[PDB]
Amino acid sequence: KVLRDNIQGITKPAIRRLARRGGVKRISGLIYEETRGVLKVFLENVIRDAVTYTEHAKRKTVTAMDVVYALKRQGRTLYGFGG
Amino acid sequence: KVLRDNIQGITKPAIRRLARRGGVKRISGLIYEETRGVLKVFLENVIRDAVTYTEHAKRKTVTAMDVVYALKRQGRTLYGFGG
Amino acid sequence: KVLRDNIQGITKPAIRRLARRGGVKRISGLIYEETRGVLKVFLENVIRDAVTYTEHAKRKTVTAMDVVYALKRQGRTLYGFGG
Amino acid sequence: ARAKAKTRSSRAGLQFPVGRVHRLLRKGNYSERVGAGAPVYLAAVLEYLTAEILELAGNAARDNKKTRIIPRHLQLAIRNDEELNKLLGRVTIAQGGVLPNIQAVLLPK
Amino acid sequence: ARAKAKTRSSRAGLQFPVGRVHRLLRKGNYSERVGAGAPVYLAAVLEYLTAEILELAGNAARDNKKTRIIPRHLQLAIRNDEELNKLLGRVTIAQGGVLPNIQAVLLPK
Amino acid sequence: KPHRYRPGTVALREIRRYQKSTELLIRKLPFQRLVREIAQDFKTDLRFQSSAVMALQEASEAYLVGLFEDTNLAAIHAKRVTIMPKDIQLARRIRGE
Amino acid sequence: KPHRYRPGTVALREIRRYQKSTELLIRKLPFQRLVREIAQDFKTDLRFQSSAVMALQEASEAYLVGLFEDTNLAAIHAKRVTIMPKDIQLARRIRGE
Amino acid sequence: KRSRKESYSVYVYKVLKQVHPDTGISSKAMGIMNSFVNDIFERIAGEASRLAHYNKRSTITSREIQTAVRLLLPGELAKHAVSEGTKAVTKYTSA
Amino acid sequence: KRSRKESYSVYVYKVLKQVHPDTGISSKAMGIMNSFVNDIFERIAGEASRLAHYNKRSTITSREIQTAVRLLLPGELAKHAVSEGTKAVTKYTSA
Amino acid sequence: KRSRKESYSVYVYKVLKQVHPDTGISSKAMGIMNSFVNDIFERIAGEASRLAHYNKRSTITSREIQTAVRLLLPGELAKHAVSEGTKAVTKYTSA
DNA sequence: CGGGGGACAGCGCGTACGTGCGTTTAAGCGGTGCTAGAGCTGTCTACGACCAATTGAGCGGCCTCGGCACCGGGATTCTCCAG
DNA sequence: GCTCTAGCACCGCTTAAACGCACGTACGCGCTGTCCCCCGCGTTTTAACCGCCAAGGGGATTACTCCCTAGTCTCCAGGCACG
């Protein structure tokens, strides 16, 4: 039921694919755990907000509408699921 | 289906005969490519006018009538096919 | 009445004192030109905004209230002038 | 004996509604009263922006010899344009990816 | 007892006169029938032409810092554009002079 | 001898392929497991719309490609091409957090 | 020989003195006249109270100085103590202009 | 007593103020614009008449000038003009 | 049937039929356009509200949005937007 | 005859004397406090307005501005503000 | 596993502001008159907001075919290799 | 439309700012060695993806009924203007 380690579920070659989308040619070996950490920290930054809207809505299920609202609160407005 | 080079079908010796009609006695190699180029430019203008006629005629086959019409508009009126 | 080139009125030692508040030890001689340029860019943006505010208000004198409104818009909110 | 219901958007000669835009201004709670020029003006600027970006989207699609617009074409269309980029710097397009913007020294010689 | 007068230019949102061009096509004697969209189409075309050239002429007048348009501004405006050059190659402009056109060999050194 | 491409050539081919590509670069179900895990850190037994998982996915990868674009600029700033943790720390400190 | 410090010691004293300092770093009159220069560049016959000139002043040192903390973080990233313009426009680009 | 001579006065003035409110007019430039609009009008009108003769239609519709403006007007100028006229005629049919 | 989820659907298709008759629309691109119109409308409406509070105005007409377009949209797009918005409000006054 | 200007003058002075009875205050610091109160009040009001927009609530409630405190105010000051606000509304409704 | 690419420090080498100190001048500091317009007050009218009705375009749902997703083979290009 | 007040305009001293030159020292960085570390590719594993099926939590909707909240009349009292 409870999950303990899925930050390693975002695999190192998947991070390599992301960095190729970011245009990175050479990636250091210490990069990948740090990317896991910063994506992790960004997920607290997003999801505390998203859970905060969700508990304002007296709901239990996370919706993409609140995801859009949380991302646009931080000035990283996401097109493609609003409306 | 589609064709990618028939500009060269108006060949180098064919361009040589055409300039032999004009009286040109010596022709360097650099002339021929620009002659096919300006051939493409002129015939492109004429066929633009012609297909604009033809689409305005609501037909799908070009006749010589709209050809001599377009040659009239461009200013190189052709005798022999009017009417 | 009209002026041409008062942008050097923000003198080079003023920029040096600014970078000393910014904690820059060594300031190259190349630096002062783009500091004046970016200062021109930022003030051009801010005064464009402020002039738009004042011209909306049908006045001819810029208030500091409109200045701090322009700083609210562009994301450099300033405290202490009646905002 | 009432007059025929003719649309305010065609009174603007435009397509984005005066009606919907005026309704979301009134119910978006931005002012107590809203002038009549407000929704027509704002619908006009949205129609200008929409026409411009779908022009660039159509040209991007025909450049990739494809017929139907895709968010790849949209994202390409946005960051060819400097003032659109300055407008939409902090906005991320769904499924758009990144336009090829490759820095020179990491390219091979 | 009568409908209020609305010009066709206001119906199309143009400010060139639709009725004037319709009259001048009737009495220019080009066909015995003219479709209704033809003169407003032509007036819109000339609207785009005149708007384009008055953008160019006003910009040129600002570039020589003069407030009023002059045929010199017009002649710079036409001759600094390629497609207007093809459109008006055989056109004489009164007091417009000639575009500043010096050949490379005419320069010293 | 089996043919072997030089180091960096396949990297540039991956760059060109993935800039041309538009699809997702993360396996979707381990991502969903991770976001359910971190949601459980803040509120127990939350449920996720699959579209909400996709939205968190695309926002997250957009955030990551923005940060990596910043760190590429930081790496070419530092006369280097191998990106380092100091580049990521620099990019985050410049961006204001 | 007369009294003279090594390079940087007077610079450190300058840095310490003007981080401690709260008074204004730039001159008043050329700043006001430059504001007027930009003003009549946009609309003629535009006037300013002294408080508005102070406000644009405060905004100028805030913006410029903030660019200098961003800039010398870039400079220490590049292992250098001397800053160069590329630090400034790269910092402006990372900020998201 | 004088007879009125028709021109394109107020239309060129209004379109200039719509594109440049702060730019003035000289009268010789105004004559140049009068001659421009007359010249381009007669070009399009004569080409339209020739098309009506040519396809043996007794009428000139919007489609005839659509044809004629890819005939005379070039390219992007022509396609912008086609778009302007298309939105103009949709507004006209809507009114 | 379900409740209507309001959108900008038919408007984006008709403006595309004005600007490009032959190309098609995907649902993802249409969602992008919906979120774009939502974002730009939200920005302009919020800044109009800001100017309403700032000049102690309970009234928001086209002049404040002209102010806001001059604020937000940079330069070329700003003056373009002012041009067709002024044409739109003039045809609104002429009905 | 001059007009009254609304400020936070004696209120901030009172809470200053509550937290530090023996200290003084400058007018420049008072401008800083007045703009600070205005800015934080505006941030909370804007996020509360957006939250009411998102969940279709036509009223501003203490629950959703508490939500806004969790949003804008970070970390430990957030739960201190929650304690302060819940205590305040407790002794308010008991009053 | 293998390997080539990258990173980075020592040495050196040319370099460029930092800083000490005299000068200028014009900003800084104190002083005076006027009016532009900033701001406050009275009028009112343009103007916008709300409600019954009514309709008409806009949206939910379904179905179709063909542009596009999926599939397969040779060329061209990139690159690398060997000549 | 009025008015009144601080900005605009003009005036007169005062060395601080600026500035410029000159000595001096540190600064960046390229070559090149040197060391090292991660990409490319091959191989192996394994659960991701697919695709297929059961089940129920709650999202969303409709209704009900009651909690609440702006508005207004009015009254008074503490914050702002003023000193």
Author numbering:
A (entry chain P), B (entry chain F), C (entry chain L): 20 to 102
D (entry chain M), E (entry chain G): 10 to 118
F (entry chain O), G (entry chain K): 37 to 133
H (entry chain H), I (entry chain N), J (entry chain R): 30 to 124
Sentences from the paper on this structure:
Here, we report cryo-EM structures of human H1-containing tetranucleosome arrays with four physiologically relevant NRLs. The structures show a zig-zag arrangement of nucleosomes, with nucleosomes 1 and 3 forming a stack. H1 binding to stacked nucleosomes depends on the NRL, whereas H1 always binds to the non-stacked nucleosomes 2 and 4. H1 contacts DNA with L1, the amino-terminal part of α2 together with L3, and α3 to stabilize the nucleosome and contribute to chromatin compaction.
In our structures, we observe a compact stacking of nucleosomes 1 and 3 that is similar to type I interactions with a contact formed between H2A–H2B dimers. The observed stacking does not allow for interactions between the H4 N-terminal tail of one nucleosome with the acidic patch of a stacked nucleosome and thus leaves the H4 tail free to engage in other interactions. H1 is absent from the stacked nucleosomes of the 4×177 array, but is present on nucleosome 1 in the 4×187 and 4×197 arrays, and is present on both stacked nucleosomes in the 4×207 array.
